[PDB]
Design a protein around this ligand. Structure first.
Ligand SMILES: CCCCCCCCCCCCCCCCCCCC(=O)O[C@H](COC(=O)CCCCCCCCCCCCCC)COP(=O)(O)OCCN
Ligand SMILES: CCCCCCCCCCCCCCCCCCCC(=O)O[C@H](COC(=O)CCCCCCCCCCCCCC)COP(=O)(O)OCCN
Ligand SMILES: CCCCCCCCCCCCCCCCCCCC(=O)O[C@H](COC(=O)CCCCCCCCCCCCCC)COP(=O)(O)OCCN
Ligand SMILES: CCCCCCCCCCCCCCCCCCCC(=O)O[C@H](COC(=O)CCCCCCCCCCCCCC)COP(=O)(O)OCCN
Ligand SMILES: CCCCCCCCCCCCCCCCCCCC(=O)O[C@H](COC(=O)CCCCCCCCCCCCCC)COP(=O)(O)OCCN
Ligand SMILES: CCCCCCCCCCCCCCCCCCCC(=O)O[C@H](COC(=O)CCCCCCCCCCCCCC)COP(=O)(O)OCCN
Ligand SMILES: CCCCCCCCCCCCCCCCCCCC(=O)O[C@H](COC(=O)CCCCCCCCCCCCCC)COP(=O)(O)OCCN
Ligand SMILES: CCCCCCCCCCCC
Ligand SMILES: CCCCCCCCCCCC
Lengths: 1016, 100, 201, 50
């Protein structure tokens, strides 16, 4: 209140406390690019070595899917079953659900469901992971000299890197791009034939001889009296060297010769997962992906991980380097540094403006110290509520700085005016001016809070960004009101004492002379206002919608996809072409290319590959020709000549939310009883019916893979059993030979590693190889595999997909031109209805949030109007006055709309927050004019015109000072083009222009609205 | 089982997965020669013991497939209780009828 | 142990290496005569260890059934000579035939702290000294040890070490807070000094 | 303030205490039982007042 004026020391102590709390906050506060925005997901991964797509869907996927019930907050669940034997079930939980609770519930359901899965997928283990996308770093390990190949480096990074880290702060979802060592045993069909053996015998002897036998204790308990000895017994120990695995005695022949495993198979320390080839700058290598943690510090975690790698780089065997592709830490650091620069430059500009207007160092010293107090206090508040310092909060503080400046300027200007005229000493003048503006300030606080709360109360992905913005603005605004009421009056009490000025006086006289013309054509004026309002609506019906602007994160990704049934040789060739192009025709900008083949985002396979592409730092690429956008648009045309690939580069998605307000993702559930063929027929009816109408939907592309040939072996049970060979033996030898067979574990360098058995490399690459294996009768004789089985070349699917337990198709599309998402997801419906009877549709991921609650936007923005009307009625103690504070918001809306639309932006979130800031400032200016007008009307008897003109003349200077300062503060944001330019331009161009239209039209229209309302 | 047998075939397997979950102040792990593995994770003050047990058990089954048999038909015994005895209650035979 | 004036009764909280019986079974020699390696291993393990077979009912409660060799047949290194393994043709051959027994050394308890091997140590402070003095003395004692060994305080020592570092800072913030409180309550900067110059007394 | 020793919390008389008895490695339960019987006899005779 006003009792701080008499006690300056109290105000100074409060300021010092705010500064201390702010410093303590900024010292320990998490920093990140973005907070947690996507709804929590839980991923269940299961592995079936060698199984097909259909076998996985029939055994692992369906059984796990049938027992996912009772989970709370479960929105949807989608499953993918690959041809590599991988089943992945993702369950998306509602916003706000605890990810740990969701993970434990899913894992417990799976724990109860496990005994129903086949033993071959039980042995591998099923991993439930509480994690999402948005990899933090893809730090990779490379070989300098040589010798060390892919498997050796991958094993080292799996056995001495992956576990030593992943305990670092902000690191909790480390993924590998290699495979640790294993004891790959490659069988030879002819050697097995010679000794009358089968893979079953090899597997059984490995299980028997590579075992850990509990010897017991010599002595032991219960023991007889007079027992003085007690020792352990060792009987066997799991084998460790691959040379020991070659001495496993399979059989002893009558001649006496011993048949060892090395005589029928080639044992070798190989890899477990052989379908992933990672290459750094062409050189072979293996890396890890650090998916960060929920509560993390995006900067200090990066420094700590780099320091850990430097620390355990002396333990590296030889010629092993620790490069860092990806690594989007510098983008966060640069963005935060730039926002801090903007915040300081705003204070500098505000001091300059106050010096140029007030022309008194004492007068200008007050805001220059009052503003940092509020900034630090807001930092303390954001830490006390548990808010991380990210791009959203900092850019909200970027509008907050202007909001605080406006209050500082109005207080100091009123005090300076009252010491200027009336010859009042500084203390008496401070008391007078604060009595004048006290209740107005509180009413303004209520109005601004009512404006900001609606954005705070949204839901979904939008809700979290809006919550960050509104929490920051509300904290800053509410702190600024209190600080202006407490700290500032004491400073004005103890600080101030007893060219452009003439230009300003002449301009004010001209303004008053022009404003006196309300007695001439006031009504026509109002008509003009209406037109502007209508124009605003027209603009509001033309500006396109977007979520966040794409930034120059410094890295991008290209995906190379071979057509179908393409081996790893061609995929490695295509990725070599991609990296050769990127590193020989873009050497100035591109620094590193880390190409991982096998790992596609659409799923593991031999016809997929993805390359992370890093870029030289921003200080080495300048302009538009050397930005990410131009680089990718230049590379897209260059890579259209990749000669049988569909390579497609692209930038990092914003937060991985959606492809602008045009993208939709529908899935065509089969329902009913129709099979997969009748569902792909419906998906072919679509993708053509939709393409027949390109006015609404354009990119209807069918996400997912298509049918491929599949070898089919028809075993003859009748003949085989008649001539002695059981069907179990045939079905087991084919499976073990062609599709791997996990046996048990073994100890390597003090670490437990798997042991696998498979056929030799040359013996499983052709259809004419199947007639090369032999199976044993009941009498010990061996008979060929071709005497029973026949071969076919059937067609089948390489990646099955289900949604909510129903076989789906995942058709994803985009809206055409200015047709919005709603018309797209309304045309896709009633088009699905024209498909064969049985099939239904469901929106997922991107459109789901827009299919359950859409009227959640305007209800609170009407409630805000009602609340602000009530607050204004309480302030002015009348019911008609607030109408001429409400009629000023479209004046700023239309100006912001013009300044954005006529420059090249859209309806991004930053535009919305800037629009609300400009609305608040226009409302404050109108409130402060009408407050003086009403005080004159109710205290010193006057007429509704003579009072309003005097109020406008009095309030001319503060508006022209705050508006000019705010416009100049956000000016460099509009002109910036470096890292983080999109967000800067969005929080720039809007407000820079919304403020100008607001100030000009407010100071020229408020008297008209006042007169019309009072006279009506 | 033996001390090295346990410390490699059970303790290593269970240990391979618990690296850092919420507040892991420090971790201990003993493996005896009587067949006993006793990992003893210790989190930071203020951590919820229920959440800590949830995290420990949701990372233990990431190691469960690597454990052998005859450790299962006895059972893993995850506990969130204190490690120091609060009270010992002994039971004796008055005259000496029942043996130990 | 040779510095009793600072640390008294330092002892290790662990177990020391013991002799251990080792049995080597000839897989080739066994398979030549028909006795399987699996059967030999199972017989030895059941005889000297135990075998949880099944559950059963006793007084209405389910309890376990265990199979083991008798007490007199489980005590001596020569007792392994009394066990017979069945051949593939039904004949029984003694286990001492295809086996060789020796003695080795092994640790009966392996420890790890933070993920690396450790030898947790206990010991009180000598009379006159305090736990901080003994703690610092042992931290100094570790520096005079072969390279490749480290020290980590744990348990009560963790908290004691944390408190020792915590305290002076806490004094600093408390002094600054009482200064600011006095300055705010009394409208002057003189009392905040005339009063704060008394805390050393 | 630098000449004072450091501590955490003073020792207390809780009315109970413990004694450990560790035998040479390789000993049996017979010898440990004898050792613990000696410990019990000492405590129950030479400290019967406490
Ligand atoms: C908002 C404040 C409430 C509205 C204005 C009421 C007066 C506030 C303080 C004020 O100016 O009063 C002076 C001192 O306060 C008083 O005499 C009593 C103040 C009564 C309001 C209680 C203020 C304490 C609130 C503490 C909690 C705030 C939240 C903390 C996180 C009176 O003038 P004087 O004392 O010189 O006159 C008597 C000497 N002849
Ligand atoms: C709900 C929102 C929660 C805060 C509401 C009040 C805002 C106060 C600011 C606040 O909490 O700041 C914390 C420290 O401030 C403090 O602890 C400052 C305490 C100073 C109190 C001074 C006495 C009150 C006088 C009020 C004016 C009297 C007017 C009378 C008319 C920041 O915490 P941090 O960032 O350090 O947290 C780091 C730990 N993660
Ligand atoms: C401190 C200065 C005076 C503040 C008075 C009220 C403090 C208590 C209060 O309501 O603040 C809560 C925490 O504040 C605190 O506990 C203060 C943090 C520094 C002490 C806000 O907590 P919240 O309701 O925002 O909950 C956040 C989780 N979402
Ligand atoms: C007293 C200082 C606050 C101590 C921590 C209080 C606390 O739980 O912090 C946040 C809420 O703070 C509060 O709601 C604390 C309000 C205490 C106000 C009275 C003391 C003024 C000093 C948690 O956040 P939450 O709102 O989710 O927690 C649900 C209710 N604690
Ligand atoms: C004398 C005036 C001038 C001097 C003032 C001096 C004050 C100095 C410092 C002020 C700044 C501190 C207090 C401002 C609020 C900050 C604390 C917010 C805590 C918080 O996080 O809660 C948010 C609630 O929104 C909120 O902001 C709370 C909403 C409270 C209800 C408001 C009305 C709701 C709609 C009802 C309509 C009818 C009208 C009712 C009268 C969102 O929650 P979260 O992020 O923790 O949640 C996450 C899961 N959702
Ligand atoms: C859209 C969803 C979210 C909505 C967010 C807002 C939620 C609603 C909050 C309340 C809305 C209606 C309240 C009306 C406030 C009008 C402020 C005008 C000034 C006024 O009457 O208050 C002064 C004192 O305040 C007082 O005496 C009252 C204390 C401060 C008001 C706030 C009270 C808690 C709310 C006047 O008092 P005076 O006449 O002595 O002034 C001295 C000179 N004459
Ligand atoms: C009572 C007199 C009333 C009459 C009028 C006078 C007006 C008020 C003037 C006196 C103010 C009253 C006391 C305010 C609360 C003081 C709290 C001190 C904060 C503090 O110790 O900081 C950290 C708290 O933890 C955190 O992380 C911060 C959470 C709590 C934030 C509180 C910030 C207040 C700072 C004020 C100075 C501890 O240090 P650390 O955790 O960083 O330690 C790291 C290395 N050990
Ligand atoms: C001592 C009287 C001060 C003026 C009347 C109270 C004004 C309250 C404004 C709103 C709360 C700060
Ligand atoms: C006078 C102060 C009023 C504050 C009310 C906050 C809900």
């Amino acid at each position: 209140a006003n009792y701080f004026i008499d006690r300056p020391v109290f105000a100074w102590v409060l300021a010092i406390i705010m500064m201390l709390a702010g410093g303590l906050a900024i010292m320990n506060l998490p920093v990140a690019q973005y907070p947690q925005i996507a709804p929590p997901t839980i991923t269940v991964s299961a592995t079936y070595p060698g199984a097909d797509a259909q076998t996985v869907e029939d055994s692992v996927t369906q059984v796990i899917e049938q027992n996912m019930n009772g989970l709370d907050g479960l929105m949807y669940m989608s499953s993918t079953s690959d041809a590599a034997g991988n089943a992945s079930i993702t369950l998306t939980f509602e916003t706000g659900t605890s990810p740990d609770i969701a993970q434990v519930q899913v894992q417990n359901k799976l724990q109860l469901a496990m005994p129903s899965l086949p033993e071959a997928v039980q042995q591998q283990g099923i991993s439930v992971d509480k994690s999402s996308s948005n990899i933090l770093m893809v730090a990779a390990f490379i070989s300098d000299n040589g010798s060390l190949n892919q498997y050796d480096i991958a094993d080292y990074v799996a056995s001495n890197i992956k576990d030593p880290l992943s305990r670092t702060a902000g690191v909790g979802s480390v993924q590998l791009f290699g495979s640790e060592y294993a004891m790959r045993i490659w069988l030879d069909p002819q050697k097995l034939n010679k000794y009358n053996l089968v893979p079953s015998d090899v597997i059984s002897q490995i299980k028997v001889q590579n075992n850990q036998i509990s010897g017991g204790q010599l002595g032991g308990m219960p023991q007889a009296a007079d027992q003085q000895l007690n020792a352990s017994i060792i009987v066997q120990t799991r084998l460790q060297t691959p040379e020991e695995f070659g001495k496993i005695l399979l059989k002893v022949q009558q001649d006496g010769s011993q048949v060892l495993l090395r005589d029928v198979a080639r044992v070798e320390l190989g890899a477990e997962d052989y379908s992933t080839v990672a290459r750094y700058n062409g050189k072979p290598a293996a890396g890890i992906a650090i998916k960060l943690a929920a509560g993390a510090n995006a900067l200090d975690t990066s420094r700590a991980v780099k320091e850990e790698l430097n620390r355990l780089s002396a333990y590296f065997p030889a010629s092993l380097k620790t490069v860092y592709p990806y690594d989007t830490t510098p983008f966060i650091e640069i963005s935060i540094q730039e926002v801090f620069k903007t915040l300081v430059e705003a204070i500098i500009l505000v001091f300059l403006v106050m010096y140029l207007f007030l022309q008194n160092f004492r007068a200008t010293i007050i805001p220059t110290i009052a503003v940092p107090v509020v900034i630090l206090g807001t930092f303390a508040i954001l830490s006390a509520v548990g808010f991380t310092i990210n791009t959203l909060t900092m850019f909200g503080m970027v509008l907050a700085i202007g909001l605080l400046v406006d209050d500082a300027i109005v207080v100091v200007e009123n005090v300076e005016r009252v010491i200027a005229e009336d010859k009042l000493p500084p203390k008496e003048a401070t008391h007078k001016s604060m009595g004048q503006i006290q209740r107005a300030l509180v009413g303004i606080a209520v109005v601004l809070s009512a404006v900001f709360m609606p954005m705070a109360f949204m839901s979904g992905a939008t809700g979290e960004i809006y919550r960050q913005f509104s929490i920051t603005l509300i904290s800053s605004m509410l702190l600024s009101v209190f600080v202006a009421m407490s700290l500032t009056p004491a400073l004005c009490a103890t600080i101030l004492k007893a060219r452009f000025n003439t230009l300003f006086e002449k301009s004010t006289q001209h303004y008053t002379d022009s404003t006196r013309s309300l007695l001439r054509c006031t009504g026509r004026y109002m008509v003009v206002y209406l037109l502007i309002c209508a124009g605003m609506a027209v603009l509001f019906l033309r500006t396109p919608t977007s979520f966040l602007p794409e930034e120059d994160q410094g890295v991008f990704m290209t995906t190379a996809q071979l057509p179908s049934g393409a081996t790893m040789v061609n995929t490695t060739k295509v990725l070599q072409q991609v990296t050769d192009y990127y590193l020989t025709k873009e050497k100035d900008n591109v620094q590193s290319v880390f190409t991982v083949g096998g790992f596609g985002f659409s799923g593991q396979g031999q016809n997929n590959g993805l390359a992370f592409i890093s870029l030289k730092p921003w200080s080495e690429r300048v302009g538009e020709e050397n930005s990410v956008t131009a680089i990718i648009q230049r590379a897209m045309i260059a890579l259209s000549s990749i000669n049988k690939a569909v390579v497609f580069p692209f930038n990092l998605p914003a937060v991985a939310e959606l492809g602008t307000a045009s993208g939709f993702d529908m899935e065509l559930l089969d329902n009913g009883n129709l099979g997969h063929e009748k569902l792909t027929q419906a998906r072919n009816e679509l993708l053509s019916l939709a393409a027949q109408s390109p006015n609404q939907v354009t990119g209807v592309r069918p996400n997912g893979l298509e049918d491929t040939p599949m070898f089919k072996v028809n075993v003859n049970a009748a003949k085989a059993e008649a001539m002695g060979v059981a069907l179990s033996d045939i079905n087991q030898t084919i499976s073990t030979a062609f599709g791997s067979s996990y046996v048990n574990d073994f100890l390597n360098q003090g670490r437990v590693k798997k042991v696998y058995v498979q056929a030799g490399t040359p013996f499983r690459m052709l259809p004419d190889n199947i007639n090369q294996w032999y199976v044993r009768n009941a009498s010990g004789t061996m008979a060929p595999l071709s005497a029973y089985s026949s071969t076919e070349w059937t067609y089948g699917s390489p990646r099955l997909e289900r949604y909510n337990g129903i076989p789906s198709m995942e058709i994803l599309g985009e809206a055409a031109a200015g047709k919005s998402t709603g018309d797209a997801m309304k045309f896709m419906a009633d088009l699905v209805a024209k498909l064969p009877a049985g099939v239904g549709y469901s929106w997922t991921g991107l459109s789901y949030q827009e299919a359950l609650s859409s009227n959640q936007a305007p209800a609170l923005y009407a409630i805000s109007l009602v609340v602000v009307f009530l607050a204004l009625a309480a302030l002015y103690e009348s019911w008609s006055i607030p109408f001429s504070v409400m009629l000023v918001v479209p004046l700023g809306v239309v100006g912001a709309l013009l300044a954005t639309d006529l420059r090249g932006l859209s309806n991004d979130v930053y535009f919305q927050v800037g629009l609300l800031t400009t609305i608040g400032l226009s409302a404050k200016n109108a409130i402060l004019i009408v407050e003086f007008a009403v005080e004159m009307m109710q205290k010193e008897g006057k007429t509704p015109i003579e009072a309003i003109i005097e109020a406008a003349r009095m309030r001319l200077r503060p508006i022209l000072m705050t508006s000019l300062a705010f416009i100049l503060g956000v000016l460099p944001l509009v002109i910036s083009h470096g890292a983080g330019s999109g967000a800067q331009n969005a929080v720039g161009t809007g407000v820079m222009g919304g403020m100008f239209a607001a100030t000009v039209l407010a100071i020229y229209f408020v008297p008209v609205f006042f007169v019309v309302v009072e006279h009506l």
